[PDB]
Design an enzyme around this catalytic site. Structure first.
Site, PDB file in Angstrom:
ATOM      1  N   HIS A   1       0.006  -4.924   1.546  1.00 58.13           N
ATOM      2  CA  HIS A   1      -0.421  -3.710   2.243  1.00 58.13           C
ATOM      3  C   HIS A   1      -1.938  -3.598   2.346  1.00 58.13           C
ATOM      4  CE1 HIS A   1       3.774  -2.782   1.498  1.00 58.13           C
ATOM      5  NE2 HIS A   1       3.565  -2.830   0.192  1.00 58.13           N
TER       6      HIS A   1
ATOM      7  N   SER B   1      -1.030  -8.024   5.917  1.00 54.05           N
ATOM      8  CA  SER B   1      -0.243  -6.988   5.268  1.00 54.05           C
ATOM      9  C   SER B   1       1.194  -7.463   5.102  1.00 54.05           C
ATOM     10  CB  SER B   1      -0.270  -5.694   6.092  1.00 54.05           C
ATOM     11  OG  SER B   1       0.376  -4.648   5.381  1.00 54.05           O
TER      12      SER B   1
ATOM     13  N   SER C   1       2.058  -0.208   6.775  1.00 52.04           N
ATOM     14  CA  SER C   1       1.342   0.165   5.562  1.00 52.04           C
ATOM     15  C   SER C   1      -0.170   0.015   5.658  1.00 52.04           C
ATOM     16  CB  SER C   1       1.860  -0.654   4.382  1.00 52.04           C
ATOM     17  OG  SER C   1       1.706  -2.047   4.621  1.00 52.04           O
TER      18      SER C   1
ATOM     19  N   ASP D   1       3.367  -9.940  -2.049  1.00 50.33           N
ATOM     20  CA  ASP D   1       3.992  -8.652  -2.360  1.00 50.33           C
ATOM     21  C   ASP D   1       5.269  -8.599  -1.530  1.00 50.33           C
ATOM     22  OD1 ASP D   1       4.895  -5.994  -2.482  1.00 50.33           O
ATOM     23  OD2 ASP D   1       2.885  -5.164  -2.547  1.00 50.33           O
TER      24      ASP D   1
ATOM     25  N   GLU E   1       3.621  -9.392  -6.629  1.00 54.66           N
ATOM     26  CA  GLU E   1       3.331  -7.995  -6.918  1.00 54.66           C
ATOM     27  C   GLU E   1       4.554  -7.171  -7.313  1.00 54.66           C
ATOM     28  OE1 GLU E   1       0.461  -6.572  -7.219  1.00 54.66           O
ATOM     29  OE2 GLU E   1       0.694  -4.430  -6.909  1.00 54.66           O
TER      30      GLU E   1
ATOM     31  N   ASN F   1       4.555  -7.823 -11.518  1.00 54.78           N
ATOM     32  CA  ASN F   1       5.322  -6.584 -11.579  1.00 54.78           C
ATOM     33  C   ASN F   1       5.626  -6.146 -13.005  1.00 54.78           C
ATOM     34  OD1 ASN F   1       6.967  -4.544  -9.908  1.00 54.78           O
ATOM     35  ND2 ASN F   1       8.425  -5.237 -11.453  1.00 54.78           N
TER      36      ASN F   1
ATOM     37  N   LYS G   1       1.640  -2.375 -14.723  1.00 58.41           N
ATOM     38  CA  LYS G   1       2.102  -2.410 -13.342  1.00 58.41           C
ATOM     39  C   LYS G   1       3.404  -1.624 -13.234  1.00 58.41           C
ATOM     40  CE  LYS G   1       3.403  -3.596  -9.166  1.00 58.41           C
ATOM     41  NZ  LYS G   1       4.720  -3.217  -8.593  1.00 58.41           N
TER      42      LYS G   1
ATOM     43  N   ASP H   1       2.454   1.797 -11.658  1.00 65.03           N
ATOM     44  CA  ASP H   1       2.615   1.715 -10.211  1.00 65.03           C
ATOM     45  C   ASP H   1       4.015   2.148  -9.772  1.00 65.03           C
ATOM     46  OD1 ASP H   1       3.501   0.307  -7.733  1.00 65.03           O
ATOM     47  OD2 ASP H   1       1.615  -0.818  -7.844  1.00 65.03           O
ATOM     48  N   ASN H   2       5.050   1.440 -10.236  1.00 61.97           N
ATOM     49  CA  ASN H   2       6.388   1.663  -9.695  1.00 61.97           C
ATOM     50  C   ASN H   2       6.864   3.083  -9.968  1.00 61.97           C
ATOM     51  OD1 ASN H   2       5.829  -1.116  -9.871  1.00 61.97           O
ATOM     52  ND2 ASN H   2       8.020  -1.630  -9.848  1.00 61.97           N
TER      53      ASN H   2
ATOM     54  N   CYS I   1       4.964   6.321  -7.291  1.00 59.96           N
ATOM     55  CA  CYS I   1       5.913   6.994  -6.410  1.00 59.96           C
ATOM     56  C   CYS I   1       5.982   8.485  -6.711  1.00 59.96           C
ATOM     57  CB  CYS I   1       7.289   6.344  -6.537  1.00 59.96           C
ATOM     58  SG  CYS I   1       7.321   4.634  -5.919  1.00 59.96           S
TER      59      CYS I   1
ATOM     60  N   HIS J   1      11.413  -1.713  -1.066  1.00 60.21           N
ATOM     61  CA  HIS J   1      10.503  -2.604  -0.346  1.00 60.21           C
ATOM     62  C   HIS J   1      10.956  -2.900   1.084  1.00 60.21           C
ATOM     63  CE1 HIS J   1       7.301  -5.610  -0.022  1.00 60.21           C
ATOM     64  NE2 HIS J   1       8.180  -6.344   0.639  1.00 60.21           N
TER      65      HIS J   1
ATOM     66  N   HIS K   1       0.192   4.478  -3.054  1.00 61.70           N
ATOM     67  CA  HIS K   1      -0.262   4.936  -4.361  1.00 61.70           C
ATOM     68  C   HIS K   1      -1.769   5.188  -4.363  1.00 61.70           C
ATOM     69  CE1 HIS K   1       3.664   3.820  -5.352  1.00 61.70           C
ATOM     70  NE2 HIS K   1       3.458   2.766  -6.119  1.00 61.70           N
TER      71      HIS K   1
ATOM     72  N   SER L   1      -2.315  -2.223 -11.308  1.00 63.20           N
ATOM     73  CA  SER L   1      -1.649  -3.350 -10.662  1.00 63.20           C
ATOM     74  C   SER L   1      -2.649  -4.421 -10.250  1.00 63.20           C
ATOM     75  CB  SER L   1      -0.863  -2.859  -9.445  1.00 63.20           C
ATOM     76  OG  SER L   1      -0.157  -1.677  -9.768  1.00 63.20           O
TER      77      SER L   1
ATOM     78  N   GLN M   1      -3.395  -8.382 -11.061  1.00 59.92           N
ATOM     79  CA  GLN M   1      -3.424  -9.425 -10.035  1.00 59.92           C
ATOM     80  C   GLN M   1      -4.622 -10.343 -10.228  1.00 59.92           C
ATOM     81  OE1 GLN M   1      -1.695 -10.801  -7.748  1.00 59.92           O
ATOM     82  NE2 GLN M   1      -0.028  -9.387  -7.158  1.00 59.92           N
TER      83      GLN M   1
HETATM   84  N1  LIG Z   1       7.077   1.937  -2.313  1.00 60.44           N
HETATM   85  C1  LIG Z   1       6.410   1.545  -3.398  1.00 60.44           C
HETATM   86  O1  LIG Z   1       5.213   1.807  -3.565  1.00 60.44           O
HETATM   87  C2  LIG Z   1       7.098   0.611  -4.355  1.00 60.44           C
HETATM   88  C3  LIG Z   1       6.540   0.361  -5.607  1.00 60.44           C
HETATM   89  C4  LIG Z   1       7.176  -0.490  -6.491  1.00 60.44           C
HETATM   90  C5  LIG Z   1       8.356  -1.093  -6.121  1.00 60.44           C
HETATM   91  N2  LIG Z   1       8.893  -0.825  -4.912  1.00 60.44           N
HETATM   92  C6  LIG Z   1      10.211  -1.423  -4.526  1.00 60.44           C
HETATM   93  O2  LIG Z   1      11.227  -0.501  -4.834  1.00 60.44           O
HETATM   94  C7  LIG Z   1      12.440  -1.220  -5.174  1.00 60.44           C
HETATM   95  C8  LIG Z   1      12.921  -0.822  -6.550  1.00 60.44           C
HETATM   96  O3  LIG Z   1      11.920  -1.212  -7.516  1.00 60.44           O
HETATM   97  P1  LIG Z   1      12.124  -0.921  -9.067  1.00 60.44           P
HETATM   98  O4  LIG Z   1      10.975  -1.487  -9.806  1.00 60.44           O
HETATM   99  O5  LIG Z   1      12.452   0.514  -9.233  1.00 60.44           O
HETATM  100  O6  LIG Z   1      13.438  -1.762  -9.415  1.00 60.44           O
HETATM  101  P2  LIG Z   1      14.532  -1.484 -10.541  1.00 60.44           P
HETATM  102  O7  LIG Z   1      15.286  -2.735 -10.842  1.00 60.44           O
HETATM  103  O8  LIG Z   1      13.755  -0.989 -11.740  1.00 60.44           O
HETATM  104  O9  LIG Z   1      15.428  -0.279 -10.028  1.00 60.44           O
HETATM  105  C9  LIG Z   1      16.340  -0.328  -8.919  1.00 60.44           C
HETATM  106  C10 LIG Z   1      17.544   0.469  -9.355  1.00 60.44           C
HETATM  107  O10 LIG Z   1      18.483   0.576  -8.267  1.00 60.44           O
HETATM  108  C11 LIG Z   1      19.769   0.652  -8.838  1.00 60.44           C
HETATM  109  N3  LIG Z   1      20.758   0.370  -7.810  1.00 60.44           N
HETATM  110  C12 LIG Z   1      21.075  -0.844  -7.249  1.00 60.44           C
HETATM  111  N4  LIG Z   1      22.033  -0.791  -6.357  1.00 60.44           N
HETATM  112  C13 LIG Z   1      22.373   0.559  -6.321  1.00 60.44           C
HETATM  113  C14 LIG Z   1      23.315   1.280  -5.566  1.00 60.44           C
HETATM  114  N5  LIG Z   1      24.145   0.725  -4.681  1.00 60.44           N
HETATM  115  N6  LIG Z   1      23.389   2.617  -5.763  1.00 60.44           N
HETATM  116  C15 LIG Z   1      22.572   3.181  -6.660  1.00 60.44           C
HETATM  117  N7  LIG Z   1      21.646   2.604  -7.432  1.00 60.44           N
HETATM  118  C16 LIG Z   1      21.594   1.280  -7.211  1.00 60.44           C
HETATM  119  C17 LIG Z   1      19.744  -0.335  -9.994  1.00 60.44           C
HETATM  120  O11 LIG Z   1      20.744  -0.054 -10.963  1.00 60.44           O
HETATM  121  C18 LIG Z   1      18.319  -0.136 -10.542  1.00 60.44           C
HETATM  122  O12 LIG Z   1      18.259   0.707 -11.691  1.00 60.44           O
HETATM  123  C19 LIG Z   1      12.095  -2.705  -5.009  1.00 60.44           C
HETATM  124  O13 LIG Z   1      12.426  -3.056  -3.672  1.00 60.44           O
HETATM  125  C20 LIG Z   1      10.585  -2.712  -5.259  1.00 60.44           C
HETATM  126  O14 LIG Z   1       9.902  -3.875  -4.787  1.00 60.44           O
HETATM  127  C21 LIG Z   1       8.304   0.008  -4.039  1.00 60.44           C
HETATM  128  K   LIG Z   2      -3.838   5.571  -1.347  1.00 60.59           K
END
Ligand SMILES: NC(=O)c1ccc[n+]([C@@H]2O[C@H](COP(=O)([O-])OP(=O)(O)OC[C@H]3O[C@@H](n4cnc5c(N)ncnc54)[C@H](O)[C@@H]3O)[C@@H](O)[C@H]2O)c1
Ligand SMILES: [K+]
Ligand SMILES: NC(=O)c1ccc[n+]([C@@H]2O[C@H](COP(=O)([O-])OP(=O)(O)OC[C@H]3O[C@@H](n4cnc5c(N)ncnc54)[C@H](O)[C@@H]3O)[C@@H](O)[C@H]2O)c1
Ligand SMILES: NC(=O)c1ccc[n+]([C@@H]2O[C@H](COP(=O)([O-])OP(=O)(O)OC[C@H]3O[C@@H](n4cnc5c(N)ncnc54)[C@H](O)[C@@H]3O)[C@@H](O)[C@H]2O)c1
Ligand SMILES: NC(=O)c1ccc[n+]([C@@H]2O[C@H](COP(=O)([O-])OP(=O)(O)OC[C@H]3O[C@@H](n4cnc5c(N)ncnc54)[C@H](O)[C@@H]3O)[C@@H](O)[C@H]2O)c1
Ligand SMILES: Nc1ncnc2[nH]cnc12
Ligand SMILES: Nc1ncnc2[nH]cnc12
Ligand SMILES: [K+]
Ligand SMILES: [K+]
Ligand SMILES: [K+]
Lengths: 461, 460, 464, 462
Positions: free
Chosen positions: D54, D77, D82, D132, D157, D182, D187, D191-192, D196, D316, D375, D383, D387
């Protein structure tokens, strides 16, 4: 040889005194009045009939009144709310008190009568301090001659004020009153934040139930319902709120609560078919906060999830239809003020029955019945107002006025805002907070005096 | 149609899309449209309106029009207009004069464009105002127009204060309704609206993380309460200042530390009086008072480097921005975001570390750096506005004999029953279900099954 | 019930019927534990197990004890803290014919005697073959004083963070004699019990001991691990202004992001032992200090001297040495308010003025405050921990480490956690107890994220 | 001067981007600390980094830290929505090749990645990858295996990208070692989760300006993103229900005060409309997907949702929501960029006043980056400090130069050591003004750690 009292156990006095000394350090507004007014003795000659929960906090109130010159005769306004160590400490101080935890209804009535009568005849009372109106009602019904010499009533709580205003409406109220409840340092301190502290407190002491993640229904969203809802939400409960007042319901929504009714489309027609059975079967805890009657009724009780907890934090136990439960269901005492109510029938129960409810304090005020009510630092505000209200009405000397002047003064009033602010300032200093002083230019800009009052009387905070 | 001035009329379609969405978020206001459309209670009304020309105000405007009124409209702040809302209202053939980023002179010109039509005073007979600026201009510059006007409906706390000062001084010329002190306005708008929109505006302006950082909120009335919550819920460590000990008590009970910028709370004018240790730790200061100079020059000099300074009270004199204009150099980051370099007045180092970030040049930050309150909150305020306009217009004060006018000159609130009726429509919009008292229950607590459910003394 | 039963020592046997009423309620709050009772009662997986147990004799421990017995075990029980027993729980267990030696308010001598009463039967070592421990005290006594009994024991199942650390130290030093299961580090234990348990019970214990308003007052929480996290939330949700101390910068980062100010009792975080290193301005503003570290002397004498008048001092870590209570016993006068609540008068050692304003309030004499001044964690939380305890006991008992040849024994002398699949099965029963509904993955979804539809759903590296 | 090796929306936004970069630097003490610490040593001298993440202001500070430590980069990106166009402009105007703008098409997205891989129509002499989500990693393995021969490592990432790396490793198709950025605690659990928390309600407010207090939300997932997302909504006053397939995560949701529900009756998703809990979905005002899984807000769920509900994804990839079904069956009305009303009345045309629509944000793409700015800098500090440290470690290991036998021993997916995780954390804490306590020697001995750390065993979950 002081014998003019009745308490559970006088040997608890030393313990009560230790807790009073701690409580004084938590009540700066009340102790500030003690230090400010001790030399003047503004209650010299006052003879106060007091009826309010005989807690450690009430102990500090009583001894402040006495330290300012008053004599008192005291009883509790609830059969379960007395702290016996507090009653013992007061009795051991030579103060007439008739109060213990776990009174019967007959004993409760006898205790109030022991304050009214001394040596079998009316005491020379001239002031009344009440919480809920029971003492006020007995005086008007049974001792009108005593009210001729009484200068006023200072009433603690919402339900008691309603009863005063009914008497005033009907022309049956015989002496003026101060509505202590509607000081902001009472209503929006005691009623709300006090229940925030003490509702989850009482539920944990009674059941030790985990509350996080469970479903609660709070009936009412006034000051008590707001504080109760927060008490449970801050523990992680999923809290739903019922209300008849659309403005209070709007606050519940805006505060992040779902607003629901026990009845389909909110219509309480008395039929079982009107009960939202799906909703009630999901509820782990119901709390009534209304000061109204039968807001947790028989059909709701029949529909509640198995093993749900039922309790009331409004002033009187008729918020819940406990009479229905006594008539139809078998009661099993778990421990004092904790009963399992077996919905399997009236004549006996299975010790391993799963279909029961848990009732706290037999539906009486649960924070005081299963714990210790509000904490000292909150009751500081309410009881500072009580002291100031007693001083004000005692100094007015209503009983000594001519008939024409009595008519001009027979009212239910609140304390002025300046007093309310000065109580609040002492409370804030007790937290170590620092209030800013307006400059002359700033006071002129918003149109107030530098010393206050800072808000118009219409302000709602 | 050419009787308007907006930033870009071509944004009208966009504004109309957002108005259609907003209507679905404003059930009380849309319920008034449906229920009074037949009666046309505002037929013959000619309303001068001065309030933030947002999407939410567009729904209010079109509600007044749908009920029969003609209007001429301006914003009540130079930064609060949403340009797509103004365009959509202009495109609907409604005179409006408002854009985001007006100058002070343009702001005054816009109000005058509602007052005047074709170089002459419009035959207005109703006033809707937010802050009292339009009311003040009418009383000072166009007093004769006030002889035709039946009433004023004022929106906000500051403007109500000004109305009461005029009544006390015998200079108010028409009756007015205090819309602010409906519960569904004050305790919905002033508190909850700022809870939604304060952290919103700070994020849009700076994109700063708020969690873990230190905030000082000056004031703890309704706006200060909502502002404090907006920050605390993000994880800020929030301290609160107050001059009112009752409001300060509420802050303590709500879990905030109550502090003063001044040692022992005494603001004696000197730098020595500033609690420099406290101010040197603050990352964000927010003023909420409706008072003057509550974030003063000496506080600004003591603030932690790179702190954010903003104001959500009605007027930009809560912060001494005049001192900063005189002494410090302003670097615009982007519209309504300025770095204020405390190193000097003439020029700055692009990499200087000793600056403050000022949002919206000290003007209302929620409307200046974001979009103000959300539609479902403004629904409460604006339904009260419509009811108050109907109420004053039907009383026809301007047509009363001189003696009858003397008894009619006052500042009143709406009855509680109407307050409750607005609240019920808001609750239904959340899907909430209000319970109906039984007859015995209503008798027990001394109310009607219909309400009002509380005495007028009740504070909620 | 058994005729003539005297093989116990409790405070008051007449509390038994009250205890039984509360055990029956607790069973309805512990669906994972009661599910194991229903699932395994017929198999009798613990038939022949003879368990020495040392853990807080609460109602929750009572349900655990009767589950082990229902699965076939005999037990002999003591508490692992002098103040944590609920006397009605101990009475109900004794009245059921189960040897238990526990009461609230033991002396240190009585505490040691109680453990020895479980170890001995009729003056001789019991033929124990299993150990269940909470903090390592029973584990230590067996290794130190009765090493020969360890020749017949198949395993130890250790409950809490401090106890696991002691086991790991023994393992690395070659002094551990039997294999063990670290029950603490199941997610349904550590991240349920240690965190959410303290969230429930810390403010509970402070309210019962002092009835102090917490809203608007200043707290310092020492530590921000699992107990520190839950404790900080217990206080913040009541409206305290909470500051957090930590030595671990990652935990400190979490506290910042969680909305707390991170501070040290020492200027610049450096403790040189002198009074000049104390941040007296900070400590003079604190109304409540809570230690949560599992470390030693984190609320030391100089901090206690600097604290605001009438501050409350308590410890929710496993052992009382988190606070220098010995210094306070040596130098200051103790006034008992009520059981487990003492005013400690900083005016001197000998006497005290009844109205002295310069005191501190110490809860539970510095022992675990949630168990000392209230009832510890609630049943529905302890359900997770104790389900793990039952599964761990079954696993080690069925492994029969004591019956293996010496060579095979060295291969299995380990400290292990339970597999993640079992952790998930405990969690599922807990979720069902809230009425929660877990979604089932479709085949395509399970393939997409690389898991089986039945789990486990996360790699062992996952931190939740 | 003479620089044309870039493609951005509008180079004239560069001064604006630069002003925001200078602000972001003061919000990113761990990253800026690494700049000061390593500038003299030049640990990335000779590194040539392909970067795909991003193109935000925060990524701008990351890029310039890598450059300041000696590296050359070519950037794109990892999402079509993003990029912050002022950030891309500032980077391009500093002479750094960047190919990124907000609102790319899918063809433009792939073209941008290819512009970083190729320079003057031939493979760039890349030797490092920062990714990422794994898109750049996948293109390199499938289309440019000769380039991976000379690449020393990948630093990935996000959770989804790590899973793709582990799949390659399992199948024996991963060609170069990787660091899982990650799973540093600074991180994943910063971050995660907390990112959010900040940016979910932010994006929802910018996209819709809807009041959230008092309304009903359904969060699908309760991992790190789902935990932060649920808090983002609850702290605004939403009534939040949570769905999960992992019973441990669902246990956490319960204990955290959330009601745990399934879109499907008894949680059984058998593909029929009959399986949908229509009563539950008919009350939901906002659904957010957080899973990294496929089709967790499916067509039958979308058909059953309450009228005018908001639908968004913060995982993602956009396939968490069945947007393809909506493009096939329902008419889309753009409100403004990245905000669409989806009219369920049919595919051909819509009534402007139709009440039966859904509001979709960012066309189902990452909603925090698509409708707001992702974020905040002070979170991304953690994060991106990780990196930089991961880039330094893999570049100094020089995997591409090792003999075949030694490569076989180092081909893995690893995390940074905990000591480094802690060092990042301390700089973050100092940025808040926090003061960490130093253990005495006896206290360190008592709990069995070095005074300077690490303070926890590698099994510790925080
Ligand atoms: N937008 C952002 O800024 C940002 C930041 C970090 C990660 N992400 C992305 O978000 C996603 C999740 O990341 P994470 O670190 O939370 O992963 P995670 O493994 O910690 O959590 C995902 C959760 O989804 C649950 N899940 C899976 N299938 C499901 C279903 N059908 N119904 C309900 N729950 C279900 C799993 O049990 C798990 O607990 C990834 O794609 C990651 O890359 C986005
Ligand atoms: K920002
Ligand atoms: N236990 C305590 O320590 C304590 C403290 C203060 C007051 N009280 C008592 O609690 C009661 C409430 O006091 P308050 O100050 O909150 O009064 P209040 O008038 O502010 O609030 C009561 C609320 O109940 C609502 N209500 C009435 N009937 C209802 C029904 N059938 N269903 C749902 N909602 C209904 C009303 O609309 C009102 O908002 C009184 O009896 C008061 O004396 C108890
Ligand atoms: N931006 C918005 O969207 C919005 C919305 C509603 C109202 N307002 C404006 O915000 C302002 C506040 O409105 P309100 O309804 O909260 O009024 P209020 O009277 O309820 O609150 C103002 C508070 O400021 C306090 N205060 C005054 N001088 C102070 C000082 N020097 N230091 C500290 N505290 C001080 C007062 O004691 C009072 O409690 C007004 O100007 C109002 O018009 C703005
Ligand atoms: N009372 C209860 O119900 C209960 C429940 C579970 C565990 N415990 C006990 O609580 C203690 C902590 O358990 P945990 O699981 O949270 O452990 P933990 O390792 O997760 O957390 C302890 C924390 O203390 C910090 N710390 C250590 N020394 C410090 C110092 N000098 N200053 C500040 N912080 C310092 C560490 O960095 C660590 O993060 C243990 O003794 C454990 O057995 C008690
Ligand atoms: N502690 C207390 N003492 C007296 N009256 C009360 N009402 C509520 N709590 C109380
Ligand atoms: N209630 C309880 N029973 C047993 N061990 C515990 N540890 C914490 N709380 C407990
Ligand atoms: K109390
Ligand atoms: K808005
Ligand atoms: K318990």
């Amino acid at each position: 040889g002081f014998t003019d009292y009745k308490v559970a156990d006088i040997t608890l006095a030393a313990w009560g005194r230790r807790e009073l000394i701690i409580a004084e350090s938590e009540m700066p507004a009340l102790m500030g009045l003690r230090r400010k007014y001790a030399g003047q003795q503004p209650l010299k000659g006052a003879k106060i009939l007091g009826c309010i929960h005989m807690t450690i906090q009430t102990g500090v109130l009583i001894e402040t009144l006495v330290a300012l010159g008053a004599e008192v005769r005291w009883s509790s306004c609830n059969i379960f709310s007395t702290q016996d160590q507090a009653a013992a400490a007061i009795a051991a101080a030579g103060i007439p008190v008739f109060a213990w935890k776990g009174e019967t209804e007959e004993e409760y009535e006898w205790c109030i009568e022991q304050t009214i009568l001394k040596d079998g005849q009316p005491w020379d009372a001239n002031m009344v301090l009440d919480d809920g109106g029971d003492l006020t009602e007995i005086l008007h019904k049974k001792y009108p001659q005593m009210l001729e010499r009484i200068h006023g009533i200072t009433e603690e709580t919402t339900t008691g004020v309603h009863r005063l205003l009914d008497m005033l409406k009907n022309g049956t109220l015989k002496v003026p009153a101060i509505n202590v409840n509607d000081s902001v340092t009472k209503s929006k301190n005691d009623n709300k934040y006090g229940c925030r502290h003490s509702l989850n407190d009482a539920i944990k002491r009674g059941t030790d139930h985990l509350l996080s993640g469970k479903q609660a229904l709070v009936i009412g969203y006034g000051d008590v319902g707001k504080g109760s809802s927060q008490s449970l939400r801050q523990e992680g409960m999923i809290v739903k709120v019922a209300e008849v007042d659309p403005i209070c319901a709007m606050q519940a929504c805006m505060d992040g609560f779902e607003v629901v009714s026990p009845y389909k489309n909110g219509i309480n027609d008395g039929t079982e078919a009107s009960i939202d059975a799906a909703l009630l079967g999901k509820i782990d805890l119901i709390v009534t906060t209304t000061g109204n009657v039968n807001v947790c009724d028989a059909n709701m009780l029949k529909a509640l999830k198995k093993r749900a907890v039922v309790c009331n934090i409004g002033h009187f136990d008729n918020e819940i239809d406990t009479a229905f439960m006594r008539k139809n269901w078998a009661w099993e005492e778990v421990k004092p003020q904790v009963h399992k109510i077996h919905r399997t029938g009236k004549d006996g129960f299975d010790a391993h029955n799963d279909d029961y409810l848990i009732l706290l304090a037999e539906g009486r005020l649960v924070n005081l019945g299963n714990a210790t009510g509000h904490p000292s630092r909150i009751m500081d505000g309410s009881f500072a107002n009580q002291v100031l209200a007693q001083i004000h009405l005692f100094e007015q000397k209503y009983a000594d006025l001519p008939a024409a002047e009595k008519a001009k003064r027979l009212s239910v009033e609140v304390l002025p805002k300046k007093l309310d602010e000065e109580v609040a300032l002492e409370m804030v200093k007790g937290f170590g907070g620092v209030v800013t002083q307006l400059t002359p230019k700033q006071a002129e800009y918003i149109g107030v005096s530098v010393e206050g009052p800072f808000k118009p009387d219409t302000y709602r905070y």
